[PDB]
Amino acid sequence: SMSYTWTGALITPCAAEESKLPINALSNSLLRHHNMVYATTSRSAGLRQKKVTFDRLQVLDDHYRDVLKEMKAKASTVKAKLLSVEEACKLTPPHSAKSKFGYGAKDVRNLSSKAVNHIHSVWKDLLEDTVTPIDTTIMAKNEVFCVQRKPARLIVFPDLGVRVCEKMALYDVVSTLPQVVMGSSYGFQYSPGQRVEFLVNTWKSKKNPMGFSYDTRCFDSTVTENDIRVEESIYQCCDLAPEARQAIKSLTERLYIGGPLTNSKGQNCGYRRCRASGVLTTSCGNTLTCYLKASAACRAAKLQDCTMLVNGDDLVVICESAGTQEDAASLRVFTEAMTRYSAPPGDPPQPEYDLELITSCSSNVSVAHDASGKRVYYLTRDPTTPLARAAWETARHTPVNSWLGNIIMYAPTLWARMILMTHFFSILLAQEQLEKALDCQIYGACYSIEPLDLPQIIERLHGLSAFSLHSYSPGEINRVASCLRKLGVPPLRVWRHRARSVRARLLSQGGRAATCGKYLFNWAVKTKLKLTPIPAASQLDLSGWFVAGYSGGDIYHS
């Protein structure tokens, strides 16, 4: 009933934590108001604990039951396979948190017999014991933001050996099942370009469209033990091997429904009875559970001709409007239904009648034109956090490069082309690291990407128009303007000058480098080059990029 109970032991760091943006000239050239940029630390841990600790009340009705029955039926068409130990090992990130049992990620990846032997014993234990709660660690996340402060987030995860067994038992399931159950409503099957297409068309398919996002207050904590058993029952509808079924049942009872929390120093911090953020089923479980409750809520609210898009706890609904007054009332009913299901709103949802004003996944659809003047929809967001994090990553070394992932996800946008591409390609030129591969996250999963590949990647993901978008919407440009003012970032005038310098230098190098200069920076020059299709675009292995979400699931690809 209580999401968390606490011993009073502190959530402790594992190493010294930085919360301040250090000052050098390179980072300051990006962003002036460095005092607005912070990183959360375990020092705010207790504040987060307050927010996520509460009692959960839950009342199901017929709509909920009908929707679950429909989900299990589609789930019943799925055949999922156990992963071999070696397959599961390959999926482990190179710097994943080491086991407390005397081996690390590299040992796992290397198929060390100490690591493999232990993983066999964990697995055998899972099969033999389906009761004893499995230990987890709780840490405060170190994440960068821009002031107006957010308390750090808490991450909860089992030992490396357990995580590997998770992959063996459930990786196939969480990679295939969600899309089958939810169909087109499953958000992680889309690249950003594809998510725009689905949204734009869904909107155009309605005679008189209304739409809204719905933000659940601290979603992971609103997830009940019943919720977590319900997901398990959905997994079990799959055609599964008997070992898998047994391992899934055990992981569910021992790990997923809850368990003891141990801090960095090995002290017991308390006990969890809600979603864990750092396990393999977090994304799929939250997405299945968010979809089930919202689908039933749509029915309780009698929304007509509903289409949903769900990414974990992030929900957007587009339906037929019944009129402005009736719409307002409908959304209140919807909200009341969600609340009974245990998913109360963080902010009360609001009807929208313009697709571009709907924010989900912190992003929205906007419009611009290609070289031919043709309309083009593209996905964008407020640049603030991406820019704050770019400043941090310029001033410090970090394992994940969010700027790289943002360039890939938001390449069509003004701010990613004008600032991110210009800034970092300038830096890589100086360091002569254009060829060096970097790690970034996509839908939770870690990928190693070569910056010089960006032109092809962008062409594959967004299309050639990504390199010629212009006349952006005034509202979007105003939002970028406000952000640059707030953070103290140079205007288009400055970045155009910088981009021309970077473009020139990339050209003189020829090769893939000249291609980056030609495609990524054609916006910076007054005489435009032609920019035909890049013949290397069609040779890229992007098959697994946008299939499923893995946030917190410890997944690495390629």
Ligand X SMILES: CN1CCN(c2cc3c(cc2F)c(=O)c(C(=O)OCc2ccc(Cl)cc2)cn3Cc2ccc(S(C)(=O)=O)cc2)CC1
* Interaction site with ligand X (CB under 6 A): 414, 417-418, 470-472, 474, 477-478, 480-481, 484, 491-492, 523
**Closest distance of CB 366 from ligand X, Å:** 11
- Record the tokens describing residue 247, joined without a space: 């391992």
**Shorter beta-carbon distance to ligand X: residue 199 or 499:** 499
**Closest distance of CB 414 from ligand X, Å:** 5
**Closest distance of CB 25 from ligand X, Å:** 21
**Shorter beta-carbon distance to ligand X: residue 389 or 417:** 417
**Closest distance of CB 471 from ligand X, Å:** 4
User: Position 313: which residue type?
Assistant: D
**Closest distance of CB 453 from ligand X, Å:** 20
Name the strands in the sheet holding 154-157, side by side, starting at the edge strand that comes first in the sequence. 4-6, 268-272, 259-262, 136-140, 154-157
Q: How far apart are CA 196 and CA 200, in angstroms?
A: 6
**Shorter beta-carbon distance to ligand X: residue 436 or 528:** 528
**Shorter beta-carbon distance to ligand X: residue 344 or 412:** 412
**Shorter beta-carbon distance to ligand X: residue 60 or 477:** 477
**Closest distance of CB 423 from ligand X, Å:** 12
The distance of Cα 151 from the centroid of its chain, to the nearest Å, equals 19
Select from 495, 496, 494, 491 the least CA-distant residue to 526. Answer: 496
Beta carbons within 8 Å of 325's beta carbon, 6+ residues apart: none
**Closest distance of CB 31 from ligand X, Å:** 14
**Closest distance of CB 522 from ligand X, Å:** 9
CA-atom Rg of the chain in angstroms: 24
551: three-class secondary structure by DSSP = coil
**Shorter beta-carbon distance to ligand X: residue 104 or 383:** 383
Q: How far apart are CA 530 and CA 483, in angstroms?
A: 32
Cα atoms found within 13 Å of the Cα of residue 259, Cβ hemisphere only: 27
**Closest distance of CB 379 from ligand X, Å:** 15
Cβ neighbour number for residue 25 with a 10 Å cutoff: 6
- Record the tokens describing residue 434, joined without a space: 């254009």
Name the strands in the sheet holding 556-557, side by side, starting at the edge strand that comes first in the sequence. 438-442, 445-449, 556-557
For residue 536, give Cα distances in angstroms to 24, 192, 464, 509, 532. Answer: 38, 21, 13, 18, 12
CA angle 202, 205, 206 (to 5 degrees): 100
**Chain length of the chain:** 558
**Shorter beta-carbon distance to ligand X: residue 398 or 501:** 501
Cβ neighbour number for residue 188 with a 10 Å cutoff: 24
**Shorter beta-carbon distance to ligand X: residue 8 or 474:** 474
Q: How far apart are CA 420 and CA 498, in angstroms?
A: 12
For residue 143, give Cα distances in angstroms to 96, 410, 554. Answer: 17, 20, 17
**Closest distance of CB 410 from ligand X, Å:** 11
**Shorter beta-carbon distance to ligand X: residue 430 or 481:** 481
Q: How far apart are CA 426 and CA 493, in angstroms?
A: 16
**Shorter beta-carbon distance to ligand X: residue 192 or 349:** 192
**Shorter beta-carbon distance to ligand X: residue 371 or 492:** 492
**Closest distance of CB 487 from ligand X, Å:** 12
Q: How far apart are CA 539 and CA 169, in angstroms?
A: 33
Select from 196, 519, 545, 544 the least CA-distant residue to 381. Answer: 196
Beta carbons within 8 Å of 126's beta carbon, 6+ residues apart: 165, 169, 246, 247, 250, 251, 254
**Closest distance of CB 506 from ligand X, Å:** 16
**Shorter beta-carbon distance to ligand X: residue 127 or 481:** 481
**Shorter beta-carbon distance to ligand X: residue 289 or 522:** 522
**Closest distance of CB 386 from ligand X, Å:** 14
367: three-class secondary structure by DSSP = strand
Q: Is 337 exposed, middle or buried (0-12, 13-18, 19+ CB in 10 A)?
A: buried
